[PDB]
Amino acid sequence: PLESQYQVGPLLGSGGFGSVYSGIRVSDNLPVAIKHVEKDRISDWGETRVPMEVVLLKKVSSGFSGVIRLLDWFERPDSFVLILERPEPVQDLFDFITERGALQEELARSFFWQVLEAVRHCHNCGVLHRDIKDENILIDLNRGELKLIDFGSGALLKDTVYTDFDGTRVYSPPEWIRYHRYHGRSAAVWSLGILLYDMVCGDIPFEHDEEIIRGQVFFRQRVSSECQHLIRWCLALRPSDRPTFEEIQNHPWMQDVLLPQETAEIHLH
Numbered sequence: 057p058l059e060s061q062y063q064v065g066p067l068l069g070s071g072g073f074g075s076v077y078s079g080i081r082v083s084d085n086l087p088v089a090i091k092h093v094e095k096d097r098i099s100d101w102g103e104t105r106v107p108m109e110v111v112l113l114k115k116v117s118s119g120f121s122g123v124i125r126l127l128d129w130f131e132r133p134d135s136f137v138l139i140l141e142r143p144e145p146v147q148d149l150f151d152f153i154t155e156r157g158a159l160q161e162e163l164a165r166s167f168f169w170q171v172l173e174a175v176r177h178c179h180n181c182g183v184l185h186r187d188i189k190d191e192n193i194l195i196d197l198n199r200g201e202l203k204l205i206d207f208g209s210g211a212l213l214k215d216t217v218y219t220d221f222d223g224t225r226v227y228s229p230p231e232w233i234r235y236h237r238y239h240g241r242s243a244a245v246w247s248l249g250i251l252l253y254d255m256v257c258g259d260i261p262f263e264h265d266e267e268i269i270r271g272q273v274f275f276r277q278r279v280s281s282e283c284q285h286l287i288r289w290c291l292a293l294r295p296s297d298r299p300t301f302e303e304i305q306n307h308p309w310m311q312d313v314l315l316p317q318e319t320a321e322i323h324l325h
């Protein structure tokens with residue numbers, strides 16, 4: 057009985073990924089997110105079959121982390137309903153950046169660092185997000201913690217090649233656009249490259265396929281030499297030339313990161 061446990065709220069937003077509503081678990085007023093997904097629209101199914109999101113989230117969730125947790129899910133004749141956690145107050149990185157524009161490097165460092173830990177956790181649990189970007193990143197405004205959301209385009213992590221991709225094009229790597237082929241970890245680093253640039257410049261670097269395959273990065277804002285360096289490194293044209301998660305976090309620009317709470321007190325409150 058879904059209609060009895062949760063009290064549906066306003067529509068938060070929708071897309072090809074389905075519709076998401078705000079809500080509260082009657083059981084204890086816990087704020088949640090209710091995601092609806094029509095079966096006719098699912099492209100990848102996992103194991104009883106279910107939408108990828110459910111399989112992936114079940115592999116990571118367990119335990120504390122920077123990934124939105126799957127509280128529960130229900131199957132209906134023509135769709136699935138996912139109960140995701142919902143932090144309040146909250147705002148996604150997209151709206152946050154659109155509001156304040158370019159983020160200060162100290163804040164960008166704290167945020168970027170949390171995303172790195174989040175992604176490392178996913179990969180560590182055999183899950184590959186495949187659509188990392190500002191929209192899929194939520195900010196818990198009080199604790200200054202970031203959450204990774206929407207694993208609708210994700211997949212199980214593997215070391216062999218990937219020939220399918222249903223993520224955000226402007227965030228996709230040169231190898232995908234030129235050969236419809238890419239490897240998990242490396243394509244992930246590239247999108248992280250776009251993300252960092254988005255954070256420190258207030259916008260994504262490439263808009264057209266030409267720009268992506270050319271891989272020339274131009275800065276419209278003042279960014280430190282080191283940050284500019286880490287960004288161009290993640291955006292290397294040759295996948296094997298990109299850094300490992302370990303190399304990124306060991307990067308000079310990634311040192312002396314702030315704690316989530318500190319980040320909140322200084323930049324969010």
Ligand SMILES: O=c1cc(N2CCOCC2)oc2c(-c3ccccc3)cccc12
Pocket residue numbers: 068069070071076089091124140141142143146148194205206207
């Ligand atoms: O998978 C998810 C998809 C979404 N949606 C996708 C459509 O646009 C609006 C955000 O939102 C989620 C949220 C959430 C986002 C913003 C505000 C409040 C809750 C919390 C947990 C999981 C999800």
